[PDB]
Structure formats: C-alpha cells, structure tokens
C-alpha cells in the first residue's frame, strides 16, 4: 500500500517516483495521459472502477477509444484547454456510464512534472 491522499497538493511530486507496479498500490484510480489523450499508465484501482484490464488499455486513446462518455466540454474540453495552456488542476464529479453500471466519481486532473504528461485521478463518491 502506497500512502498518498486523493487531492493532495503535491501529488505529482509523489507519483513521479513511482513505477507501474507501485501505482497499483494507490487508494484511488490513476491514469497518465499524453497531450493527445493516449494512455501511458493505468493503475489497478481504475481497472476496478471501469472493468478495463490495465495492460490492454495502455496505448489507446482515453477520449476516442476507451472512455467516450468523457468526450464532452465538461471533461475532455477541460483537458484540451489545460494541454493548450500547459497548466491544469481541476476537480469535479462525473458519471462514468459507458458499457458499465453508471458510477459517480470524483475526478482530479493535474499536469505531471513530466513535460507532456497529465494525470487523471478517479475515486468513488
Ligand atoms: C465514460 O465513458 C467514462 C469512463 C469510462 C471509462 C472506462 C470504460 O470502460 C467506460 C467508461
């Protein structure tokens, strides 16, 4: 178990040191995306929420392929503006509903310390 709290103010510093098998110890879902929304990392806790096998989603586009209910101004729209701006730190609730039981979650999106990477953190509410 890796001790990190959802929403912590220096979470990107914390996760920088972590390997993929370390990300799997987090109490919340964590996805790492490039600027184009392609999944670079995907932890086990997100797999528990969405039903995806984490290995099978790496390389796919989060907005186009994997999570199409996120393709909207309220989610994808924010990300695309954070990528354009190169700054992003936003937290909001959303309902995941694509090919799964509708589940209400808290999403936190934040820029990584990495130069062109972005985090999406997901926990149940
Ligand atoms: C809407 O599509 C949000 C999330 C999501 C993530 C994974 C899967 O498989 C479905 C939906």
Curated annotation (Swiss-Prot):
GO terms for biological process: phototransduction; regulation of DNA-templated transcription. The modification S-(4-hydroxycinnamyl)cysteine is found at residue 69. SUPFAM superfamilies: PYP-like sensor domain (PAS domain). The 4-hydroxycinnamic acid (p-coumaric acid) chromophore is covalently bound via a thioester linkage. Residues 23-86 form the PAS domain. One of its GO terms (molecular function) is identical protein binding. InterPro entries: PAS, PAS-like_dom_sf, PAS_fold, PYP. Keywords: Chromophore, Photoreceptor protein, Receptor, Sensory transduction. Belongs to the photoactive yellow protein family. Photoactive blue light protein. Probably functions as a photoreceptor for a negative phototaxis response. Monomer. NCBIfam families: photo_yellow. This is Photoactive yellow protein. It comes from Halorhodospira halophila. The gene is pyp.
């Amino acid at each position: 178990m890796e001790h990190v709290a959802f929403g912590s103010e220096d979470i990107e510093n914390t996760l920088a040191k972590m390997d993929d098998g370390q990300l799997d110890g987090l109490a919340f879902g964590a996805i790492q995306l490039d600027g184009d929304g392609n999944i670079l990392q995907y932890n086990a806790a997100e797999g528990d929420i969405t039903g995806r096998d984490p290995k099978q989603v790496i390389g796919k586009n989060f907005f186009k392929d994997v999570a199409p209910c996120t393709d909207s101004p309220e989610f994808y729209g924010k990300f695309k503006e954070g990528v354009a701006s190169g700054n992003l730190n936003t937290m909001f609730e959303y309902t995941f509903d694509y090919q799964m039981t509708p589940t209400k979650v808290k999403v936190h999106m934040k820029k990584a310390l990495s130069g062109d990477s972005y985090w999406v953190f997901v926990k149940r509410v």
